[PDB]
Symmetry: D2
């Protein structure tokens, strides 16, 4: 007894490259209406693009508004990262943690009003990155606590070792000792999880962290 | 970029009632070849059933054998829990913890040999239940560590309050179908890189 | 602002060797009244010992009784683990999981009645061990939920590699004394508001 | 076989009030050399005080230096918090997360050189607070990973409901349903845990989160 498909207004932050693109293209193939944010380089053919520096609250506000006018209010929000000294630490925190907050907060009133919302946070694949990842999880669990009564869930996807364009650039196999699956994952493997969390099957999952790591984070 | 569907040989333990039945029915509608074990009340209409007491290793072996003949070697195992004194403690541990081991072990040979397997353990919705459920998660994580190299994963679904409340973020109970939805995903081609995970299906309860 | 010392009646299961012995010796030096169970090789010099097979509920009851007479009703229980086929699986589950339940249950009446108790379960340093250890944590959390109102806590110590390595942040093994140090703290007046916790003693390993 | 006591150079951030003071006074009663940071109001009689806004990297630097000259390099660091809109969110993140980083980073070189260090982070007792608490844990686990080989551990203390001066000001008993112990904890109960983590008995605990919550966070 599978729930009939509903085509959602979807926003994928950083949806023009790497894992973000895989997610964006999967969700579009699913039958959703998919928009993406980028840093200026352009949204991939097919999809609706807005330029957004997630460090900037006004840019986020204007982005959501252009999306709203284009395809209706954001129902499904996929938040992708984002990006030792004080400057390096605050930069990653601003992009990856506070950037997640900014987009989540801009999304929340519309989702609460409409009694539908899926916030899906993609954790980064080092003190700054560890801190911002754990912070997003803490934040997501907190959004889940407040908003779930309104049918607005917040869940996290925690990717393990995934083959990106930039992953392939490293001297890499020492990582496989720590992975029970004994292999790297694909961008498509992560996008499959986002697709499920975006579907009508995930309505009773809220405040969860799903690891997509071949067993690594056990 | 969806991966093409593959019809799997599925065994659902306790697939005749409640959460078990909804799982068996969803997987059949998904397009899998679905068999169920049951305690004696009968399989669901149309689906191949076998009577199994999961405290009985020989009854486990017979069931798997009869299923292998019917529809081919078991590729995906959905293990549903079968249900303070020393007697009651050991009973629940035998059914819910050792029972999961018995089915997981009987399934594992053919999964490793054939280089595909998905083990999906559904935790139970007292000291004995707490220990059985936690014991299953530890056992699943251990199987995940051993067999993931052979494309054989082990994951756990942790249901909350399912109808078969203020202290729940969602402020409602879950349906048996919301559980079966997650099992359908775990049994699908989209879950290949998930292994050793506990997916809570509880509307935010166990956070 | 340290709370004054109270000499507790302590039972340490398997307190005759390895981690068990170091725990029993530390607690005795701390100033507690320390008894140990053992498998038959004998108690440590000076300490009151009783032979117990933790798979035997009646042997558990007898031991507690003999200890109550010797030094007074057990106030702090340190439960040390006693140590793939269906036979080997059930064996480890009986000793490490059900064995912990048997001692925890025999201890609990007097702790609730007397409004003080500290249960300290030492996890083991395979599918059976993974399940037993995870099962003990779930059981400890359950006891913690039930009995904490009566000033009866249950906590778990999870030791890593203990000498009784690159994949360890500390880059060394732990001593049996580093484990006993944490048990000493858990048995002390400083631990009253810790209940249902798993304290890892592993140099960062299980992070 | 208890390890002989060693009197450590200790720094307690926010050690002049509430749980911070309890910790500071306990550690001093233990026999450590205890310094505290404050916001201007003064360190409690007995103890060495430095004024430090943990938002300010230069103030942190000068504080550690005054402590070093007074009683020797910081061996034991107790980091106390610290303190929905963007401003409120970034303020709590700056004080509670980046503030933790600042003091941890200023402490680290001396601890690494001397092959001794105990970093103990006291988590706050809401999206901003949840995020910063989870972030500190993520950070601490990351410090533990890098520094433990040099005998520098990082552990977290996660207080449940504790009776402060400010706790007593709230309409409070609805909290007790969620606490198996069925009572509030005392500042002294938390300080007892810090005392253990600061002692010679905690050397093989690193990257741990100890909850002091009567069972609450189970």
């Amino acid at each position: 007894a599978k729930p009939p498909f509903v085509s959602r207004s979807v926003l994928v932050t950083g949806g023009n490259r790497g894992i973000g693109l895989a997610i964006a293209q999967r969700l579009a193939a699913d039958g959703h209406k998919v928009a993406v944010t980028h840093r200026g380089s352009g949204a991939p053919k097919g999809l609706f693009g807005v330029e957004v520096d997630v460090t900037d609250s006004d840019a986020v506000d204007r982005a959501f508004t252009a999306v709203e006018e284009h395809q209706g209010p954001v129902e499904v929000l996929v938040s992708n990262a984002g990006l030792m000294t004080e400057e390096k630490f605050e930069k990653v925190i601003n992009a990856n943690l506070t950037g997640a907050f900014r987009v989540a907060q801009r999304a929340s009133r519309s989702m609460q009003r409409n009694k539908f919302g899926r916030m899906i946070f993609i954790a980064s694949v080092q003190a700054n990155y560890a801190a911002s990842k754990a912070g997003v999880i803490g934040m997501a669990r907190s959004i889940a606590r407040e908003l779930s009564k309104a049918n607005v869930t917040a869940n996290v996807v925690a990717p393990g070792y995934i083959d990106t364009d930039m992953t392939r650039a490293l001297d890499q196999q020492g990582a496989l000792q720590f992975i029970p699956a004994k292999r790297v994952g694909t961008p498509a493997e992560v996008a499959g999880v986002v697709s499920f969390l975006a579907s009508e099957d995930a309505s009773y999952i809220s405040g969860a962290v799903i690891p997509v790591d071949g067993g690594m984070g056990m």
